[PDB]
């Protein structure tokens with residue numbers, strides 16, 4: 001459970017935003033990419049797994065599940081690749097709502113950043129620091145620390 | 150102390166590797182960039198600070214310390230910018246040894262990755278997971294968790 005992440009791909013300004021969500025905490029990392037290819041997803045997962053202990057990833061769609069480059073990255077990083085089928089249906093809505101929320105933050109920072117990629121990183125910052133009272137950043141650290149001990 | 154990071158810029162294959170080191174743990178994040186400009190450094194710091202609680206950054210050189218874009222990023226993210234002058238002289242050697250180490254890992258993975266950027270991320274992974282017995286990844290989580298509670 002502390003090692004479970006969910007991939008989520010959303011769109012804005014004819015551009016692609018790739019998000020990884022730490023399921024137990026709501027903590028995220030995100031990137032703007034030209035298009036959602038196997039290669040982009042594979043590279044994104046390698047980066048994520050070098051930064052946090054990623055044990056299982058619920059992939060966002062079947063093309064990434066199938067991709068040989070994604071499978072190579074998951075093998076390299078010791079990640080168990082699983083589907084992202086919301087057997088628990090409330091998953092779809094939670095993801096959808098987060099995409100709403102992130103797009104809203106992006107809109108709020110648009111006067112400050114010239115480029116979408118910058119606004120996305122500002123949105124990651126705001127999301128992970130937001131007190132909901134604990135923040136996502138605080139929850140992921142405690143969950144993983146408790147897991148180690 | 151749990152919030153202190155050190156910037157470190159090193160070179161390989163006529164390309165630039167930008168590293169941020171969590172001083173108390175040895176945990177790192179890194180990126181390949183075309184050149185070390187204010188803009189690249191500013192963007193790198195924004196990303197880092199959305200992902201971990203960055204309170205103070207010891208900048209790697211005077212150009213980044215001075216850069217108005219770096220200052221804007223640090224202001225935005227709530228980061229105290231400080232010099233990286235090794236008042237403790239043993240800092241230079243510790244950084245230098247890590248750069249050795251990272252370049253060595255990059256060489257060991259060079260058959261597996263077509264592109265330097267991929268090899269750098271593999272090196273980040275290996276460094277943060279390496280048991281020294283605790284790993285850098287384990288130390289940063291415990292340090293920050295202890296700081297919160």
Ligand SMILES: NCCCC(=O)N[C@H]1Cc2ccccc2[C@H]1Cc1ccc2c(c1C(=O)O)OC[C@H](CCC(=O)O)O2
Pocket residue numbers: 039040042043046068069072073076077261262263264265266267268
């Ligand atoms: N050519 C056959 C290679 C065999 C093959 O599949 N290798 C695996 C091995 C391996 C091991 C770990 C992670 C990925 C990979 C794959 C490598 C790879 C994937 C995505 C990339 C890559 C490269 C690269 O090879 O460095 O380059 C950077 C690029 C940046 C984002 C973009 O631009 O998409 O994403």
Ligand SMILES: NCCCC(=O)N[C@H]1Cc2ccccc2[C@H]1Cc1ccc2c(c1C(=O)O)OC[C@H](CCC(=O)O)O2
Pocket residue numbers: 111112113114115116117118119188189191192195218221222223225226
């Ligand atoms: N519109 C007013 C001027 C904007 C301006 O400079 N303000 C500050 C405000 C602010 C607030 C937080 C972080 C950075 C910044 C600066 C923004 C910025 C910096 C680096 C960048 C940027 C942009 C951007 O502007 O989005 O673009 C992406 C690029 C990353 C790609 C790469 O180079 O790796 O690096």
